[PDB]
Write an enzyme that holds these catalytic residues in place. Structure first.
Site, PDB file in Angstrom:
ATOM      1  N   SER B 112       0.836  -1.202   0.000  1.00  0.00           N
ATOM      2  CA  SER B 112       0.000   0.000   0.000  1.00  0.00           C
ATOM      3  C   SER B 112       0.873   1.255   0.000  1.00  0.00           C
ATOM      4  O   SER B 112       1.786   1.371  -0.813  1.00  0.00           O
ATOM      5  CB  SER B 112      -0.951  -0.022   1.205  1.00  0.00           C
ATOM      6  N   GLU B 235      -1.630  -2.692  -7.881  1.00  0.00           N
ATOM      7  CA  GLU B 235      -2.870  -2.923  -7.151  1.00  0.00           C
ATOM      8  C   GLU B 235      -3.350  -1.609  -6.560  1.00  0.00           C
ATOM      9  O   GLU B 235      -2.557  -0.707  -6.280  1.00  0.00           O
ATOM     10  CB  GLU B 235      -2.710  -3.998  -6.057  1.00  0.00           C
ATOM     11  N   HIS B 303      -4.825  -5.629  -1.195  1.00  0.00           N
ATOM     12  CA  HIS B 303      -5.517  -5.381   0.071  1.00  0.00           C
ATOM     13  C   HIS B 303      -6.537  -6.458   0.422  1.00  0.00           C
ATOM     14  O   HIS B 303      -7.071  -6.472   1.527  1.00  0.00           O
ATOM     15  CB  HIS B 303      -6.229  -4.021   0.038  1.00  0.00           C
TER      16      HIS B 303
END
Lengths: 335, 333
Positions: B112, B235, B303
């Site tokens: 992230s 992502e 995630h």
């Protein structure tokens, strides 16, 4: 630089929807904006995606590029104006007819997401484009603030290009998210005294570059991002961001050596900044990120998502007088 | 490339909070994660900002950089693990001790927002870092999904570096937003709908991470150059379709799709398609404007739970015909 012909009362303005389909989703405000400009004497040409929706956008990437290009091809149009922003203008850049823009320079104006087009077009063509009103948010705003926005719009775009132009300072402003898309206001917006601050001394003059900072991330690194050069003045504004996001974007600039190059920074007033309970303002965050680098900053220029909004040519020289607390355009920006 | 030593059970793991102060705001989940890894036999060293808050972040830019650097300087630590992401890791980049990282390479892992550090460290040092578990979101997850996450973590980081490694495919996954920091019931489980769009086999250096986060380092000396032949891994989490189109077009404008040999899309947690019913792959297809790039859509490194561990900066082979993905280059000493 490549300059467009100046605007005049009675000219034709064409509008386009490069991202959000607000001619449908904010139709009352759209109609109010159309009526406002018509009553000033402008003729309006509606872009081909007016009244259309593709969920979150007005049409496909290619449809949106076509809509814009068709306005460029129309010899009757003096000004091409964004209806509203969104997120998706950057998609259009590979498909715009840059040769036609060069052949037929026009006043291109808007803000927010439309930054991708304003900056991209400047990068490809050298055309001086404008950070300023979009039809729906800017001219669909209820009085009294819309009149101040309009006064700047018409002054900047119609004035004779002789001598410097020094900006007026709006007496009051607001950023409240009310009175958006209905016939009548719910209640009057809070009107704030202008709290613009000039951090620095002396006068700094340099080419202004920038726009909506979050939007710039979508063109960054590409041939459509104008190169920032030593001595430039950086102009940046954002809307409704968290302090976390603002730190991230300021650090992005830092990592890219922007703060080693620019001679001053202009921060547009940030609409409804979310400081996460810290009570910190964006300038305080910028100061931490700068890590001792001394750059004079005009904090709170009225050219952003707040109302009213001034019109600013991008890619020409401005002079910020930090002692006298004013800001001027010093280089010719229309024919 | 610069390679860290492999992990071993019993090693010391140090953790740091380079953005959100979740050791405070998600304290229950934090304690679950600590207990989970301790039960496996690991010793944990807490970074100096553990238990601190500065509103939206764990501390000042400089203090966060110091927190990370201090873990690098600790000779007992073999793995430096993010507690959680946020928004603000990119701020640390001017202040990380890259020379110390080169002098004592360690396993650096997270995902992230921590992408800014993983990519930045690779750009500056050549160290092979890992897109993988962060202590709080990943190891504070309840069973059964946490166990599948851990199985990948321990397999990737401890295996002998002999022959290719072919990933297992999680049988089930979830992105349901329940049981965060509180359980009343297990998360809803979905069959794995990962898809391989293409044919043949593609092998190339993998590069990327969280795409939104990459915008905060893009254009700088901390963004690793994407090269001809790379496999792009990206992502995102909880984004609108509008944002996804914007990020894909950003890549297009940067000529990325003229260079990459394949794209891996991690499963997108709770994607908001704005009523269009479109998935990110369809948006990518529009943006590609005819470019025939093979895509692995829905890799379990994102995630969603469970999460696989992926070395960044080494060659992978995606076999589109046999529907598998493997690491083909040595990634630990």
């Amino acid at each position: 630089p490549l300059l467009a012909a100046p605007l005049a009362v009675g000219d034709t303005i064409g509008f386009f929807s490069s991202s959000a389909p607000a001619t449908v989703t904010a139709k009352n405000r759209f109609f109010r904006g159309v009526e406002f400009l018509q009553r000033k004497g402008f003729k309006l040409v509606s872009g081909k995606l007016t009244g259309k929706t593709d969920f979150y956008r007005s049409g496909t990437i290619k449809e949106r590029a076509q809509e814009f290009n068709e306005l460029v091809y129309n010899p009757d149009i003096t000004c091409i104006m964004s209806t509203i922003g969104g997120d998706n203008s950057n998609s259009l850049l590979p498909f715009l007819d840059y040769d036609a823009i060069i052949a037929n320079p026009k006043i291109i104006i808007g803000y927010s997401d439309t930054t991708a087009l304003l900056a991209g077009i400047y990068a490809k063509t050298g055309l001086i484009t404008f950070y300023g009103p979009a039809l729906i948010p800017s001219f669909g705003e209820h009085p009294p603030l819309v009149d101040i926005t309009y006064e700047s719009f018409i002054k900047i775009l119609t004035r004779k290009q002789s001598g410097i132009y020094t900006y007026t300072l709006p007496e009051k402003w607001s950023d409240e998210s009310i009175n958006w898309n209905e016939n009548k206001i719910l209640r009057p917006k809070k009107l704030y005294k202008n709290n613009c601050a000039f951090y620095g001394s002396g006068k700094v003059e340099g080419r202004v570059i920038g726009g909506n900072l979050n939007t710039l991330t979508g063109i960054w690194g590409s041939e459509w991002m104008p190169e920032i050069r030593n001595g430039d003045i950086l102009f940046i504004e954002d809307s409704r961001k968290s302090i976390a996001t603002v730190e991230r974007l300021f650090s992005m600039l830092k990592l890219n050596r922007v703060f080693d190059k620019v001679s001053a920074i202009i921060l547009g007033k940030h609409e409804l900044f979310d400081c996460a309970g810290s009570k910190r303002r964006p300038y305080e965050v910028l100061t931490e990120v700068l890590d001792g680098k001394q750059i004079p900053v005009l904090d709170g220029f009225d050219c952003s998502h707040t109302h009213p909004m001034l019109t600013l040519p991008l890619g020409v020289k401005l002079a910020i007088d930090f002692d006298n607390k004013n800001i001027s355009i010093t280089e010719q920006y229309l024919s």
